């Protein structure tokens, strides 16, 4: 049955195979059908815009001359040590360990692990309504529309790992799978993207950052009932230094407005002393006014 | 046999040799190039390059179209312009009908910036990419440009700490080493650092230290812990004039300190508006 001549019949020495040419030359553009699977969550970098994760990038396409009419098995897989003489599409990410299936009709499946900390352009208006979103784009570089088309598979090709937990955030199930297609001077390319929505629970930086500031809110009010008010604004000065551990230098202001509304009212009691119920209750009429907006 | 018509240039037919340059015994060619950026932050820039030249040994009359894309595995036997950044595989191939090659380089190099660091809130942070030559003197290649549209910026790329201004200075930087004469091109990127953060985070709470001076055993260390977050990673005159403001309160003048600040208020706006 010659199990070593089976590899020679389609590639190798005979049959004239070459990975330097597009399959079905002078013909239709070979579309692929991708599917992704995230593996390891970690290190939300609000300083360097990063997002560390490795993903299985499996893709299904069609190859005309990679068929066979000798062996009865349909879906036979191969070792990764053959891809140096096997056609592969040009994959990289614009926001920047294999297997080889050879089917009977010509379908080829190819999955690698992209080891890449993904760059993430996010907005940080106000995190209980500004949902964190990281965008990864699978746009090619070597071929235009007439040779290579990218698209997502309609059956739910994107999914989250099962036992994946995540710190400081929660990860949702539904997501958008629209197009982001490019236009360059070489031509126009095939971009496809997904949006990983990230919101929180009812505040861990409530407990981490706001509760140590809310602990000062009670502590800044005990002067109502000189060495106390200057110490508590010095404590707010120390909490302002603790609020810049790895936070970026954002030109707009952050939901920074909670530190500033407590930094504003702590010296207002001491200049009033320089000048008992009405001033601490003036915060509570604004604190109840504060949290109504953030349920959007 | 259209499969054995692709090795007509390289491999057993017509003898193309990539270790010899074509158009030899002749003039230097014009390797006109162009760049493309998509995302820069943290100095880290991702650059896509484009190129253009010509040679008589890459012409054909078999296929009618000019746009003929090879895969990125054909760069092993083509002539490459010997590029590297003087302050430092996704490669699209293209062969036109007369012989024009739209060759490309994807750049993951990390650029560095000899910038003016004095007025860091209000400086034109001009940064340079030297796309200059390595392996030839001025007898084989000349770096020129597309005369219009030599720099392209993505639309959604609006990152904080600054903005990227629209006008960019582009001129020559022509090098002279002991090997010979090297061609050099550059692109001054006029980055203007924005306001807002350095006012609200740095100025105003340290301006508030002036406000509770309007004590002496803790306002001195209040300015000390400002340097705990402003020295670990125009701002230094403010750390020096408030170094005296905390001592002037430690050493008419009730209104005099907002008049001694009134001569300093516009003093920031006159100088640091450029």
């Amino acid at each position: 049955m010659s199990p070593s001549d089976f590899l020679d019949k389609l590639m190798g020495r005979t049959s004239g195979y070459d990975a330097r040419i597009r399959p079905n030359f002078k013909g239709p553009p070979v579309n692929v059908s991708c599917n992704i699977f995230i593996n390891s969550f970690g290190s939300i970098a609000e300083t360097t815009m990063d997002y560390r994760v490795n993903i299985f990038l499996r893709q299904q396409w069609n190859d005309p001359r990679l068929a066979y009419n000798e062996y009865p098995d349909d879906s036979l897989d191969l070792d990764p040590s053959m891809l140096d003489s096997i056609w592969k599409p040009d994959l990289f990410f614009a926001n920047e360990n294999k297997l080889l299936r050879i089917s009977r009709n010509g379908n080829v499946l190819y999955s690698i692990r992209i080891t890449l900390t993904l760059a993430c352009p996010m907005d940080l208006k106000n995190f209980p309504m500004d949902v964190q979103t990281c965008i990864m784009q699978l746009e090619s570089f070597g071929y235009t529309m007439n040779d290579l088309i990218f698209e997502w598979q309609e059956q739910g090709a994107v999914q989250v790992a099962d036992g994946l937990t995540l710190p400081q955030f929660i990860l949702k199930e539904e997501k958008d799978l629209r197009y982001c297609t490019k236009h360059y001077n070489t031509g126009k390319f095939t971009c496809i993207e997904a949006r990983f929505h990230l919101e929180r629970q009812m505040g861990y930086y409530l407990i981490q950052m706001y509760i140590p500031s809310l602990l000062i809110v009670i502590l800044s009010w005990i002067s109502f009932w000189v060495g106390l008010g200057i110490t508590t604004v010095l404590t707010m000065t120390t909490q302002s230094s603790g609020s810049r551990a790895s936070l970026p230098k954002v030109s707009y202001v952050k939901a920074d407005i909670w530190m500033a509304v407590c930094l504003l009212f702590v010296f207002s009691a001491l200049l009033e002393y320089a000048a008992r119920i009405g001033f601490p209750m003036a915060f509570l009429i604004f604190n109840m006014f504060y949290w109504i907006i953030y349920k959007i | 046999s259209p499969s054995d018509f692709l090795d007509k240039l390289m491999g057993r037919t017509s003898g193309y040799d990539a270790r010899i340059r074509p158009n030899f015994k002749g003039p230097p060619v014009n390797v006109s190039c162009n760049i493309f950026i998509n995302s820069f932050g943290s100095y880290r820039v991702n650059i896509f390059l484009r190129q253009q030249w010509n040679d008589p040994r890459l012409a054909y009359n078999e296929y009618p179209d000019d746009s003929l894309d090879l895969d990125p595995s054909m760069l092993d036997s083509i002539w490459k312009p010997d590029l590297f950044f003087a302050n430092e595989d996704n490669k699209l191939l293209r062969i036109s009908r007369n012989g024009n090659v739209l060759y490309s380089i994807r750049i993951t190099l990390t650029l560095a910036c000899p910038m003016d660091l004095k007025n860091f809130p209000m400086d034109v942070q001009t940064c340079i990419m030297q796309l200059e030559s390595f392996g030839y003197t001025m007898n084989d290649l000349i770096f020129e440009w597309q005369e219009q549209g030599a720099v392209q910026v993505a639309d959604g790329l609006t990152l904080p700490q600054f903005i990227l201004k629209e006008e960019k200075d582009l001129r020559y930087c022509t090098k002279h080493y002991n090997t010979g004469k090297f061609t050099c091109i550059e692109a001054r990127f006029h980055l203007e650092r924005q306001m807002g953060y350095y006012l609200i985070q740095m100025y105003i709470p340290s301006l508030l230290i002036v406000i509770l001076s309007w004590l002496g055993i803790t306002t001195v260390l209040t300015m000390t812990t400002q340097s705990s977050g402003s020295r670990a990673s125009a701002i230094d005159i403010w750390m020096a004039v408030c170094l005296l403001f905390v001592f002037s309160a430690l050493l008419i003048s009730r209104i005099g300190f907002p008049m001694a600040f009134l001569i300093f208020n516009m003093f920031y706006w006159i100088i640091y508006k450029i």
Epitope: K26, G27, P28, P29, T144, M145, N146, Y179, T181, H183, N185, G187, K188 | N34, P64, D65, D66, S67, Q146, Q148, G149, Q152, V153, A154, D155, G156
Partner: antibody, heavy 115, light 101 residues
Framework: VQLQQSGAELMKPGAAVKISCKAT????????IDWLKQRPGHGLEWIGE????????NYNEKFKGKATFTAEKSSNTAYMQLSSLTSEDSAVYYC???????????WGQGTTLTV | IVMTQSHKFMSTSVGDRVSITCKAS??????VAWYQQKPGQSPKLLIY???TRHTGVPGRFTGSGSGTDYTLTISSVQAEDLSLYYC?????????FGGGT
């Protein structure tokens, strides 16, 4: 994606024609804007495409010199420019934004020029 | 190469077979789009790369084509949607359309 052009407009022979394809909804500096010439009597014909951020173009071989382009980021438009208006201006000008291919799906309402 | 229709004005009754021919001298690809131009408005897109329908195309408009000469069929032709049908060719530097049918 909606594209809005200018209204009806008339010019003298030998002059220049300036029309604007206003692109509402998306950024002007990303997608290609290719322009078509729809003249009755004969079949339809093609002019040439441009990118509004670099000015790169690929004209038709018989239509060079007649067509020049101009981009403007502050107006979110693309400009068609002509010269030496002869009697072959009996056509309707369109702005076609082919986003996912070099075919055309996103058109304008049409601009009426004649000489 | 140019994209020319064979017959200028073909017509049948409501809901019959039609054979729209788009004549080419060689076989380069299947990269051919199709259009309709109603009298008074803009030409809209129907089929792209001769197989896949556009978002908004109501069903029966099915394109095809293989070889040097191209053909298709429209099964249920409505009485109110008979207008000019054009060819398209984006596999070369002349991006020419058709004459109209």
């Amino acid at each position: 994606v909606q594209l809005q052009q200018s209204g009806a407009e008339l010019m003298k022979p030998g002059a220049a024609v300036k029309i604007s394809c206003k692109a509402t909804g998306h950024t002007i500096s990303r997608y290609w804007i290719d322009w078509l010439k729809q003249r009755p009597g004969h079949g339809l014909e093609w002019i040439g495409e441009i990118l509004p951020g670099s000015g790169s173009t690929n004209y038709n071989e018989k239509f060079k010199g007649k067509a020049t382009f101009t981009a403007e980021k502050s107006s979110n438009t693309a400009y068609m420019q002509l010269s030496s208006l002869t009697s072959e201006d009996s056509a309707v000008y369109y702005c076609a934004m082919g986003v996912r291919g070099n075919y055309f799906d996103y058109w304008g309402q049409g601009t009426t020029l004649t000489v | 190469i140019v994209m020319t229709q064979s017959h200028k004005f073909m017509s049948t009754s409501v809901g019959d077979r039609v054979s729209i021919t788009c004549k080419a001298s060689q076989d380069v690809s299947t990269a051919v789009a199709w259009y309709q131009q109603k009298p008074g408005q803009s030409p809209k897109l129907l089929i792209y790369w001769a197989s896949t329908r556009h978002t908004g195309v109501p069903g029966r408009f099915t394109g095809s084509g293989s070889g040097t000469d191209y053909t298709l069929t429209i099964s249920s032709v409505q009485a109110e949607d008979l207008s000019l049908y054009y060819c398209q060719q984006h596999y070369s530097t002349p991006r020419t359309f058709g004459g109209g049918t």
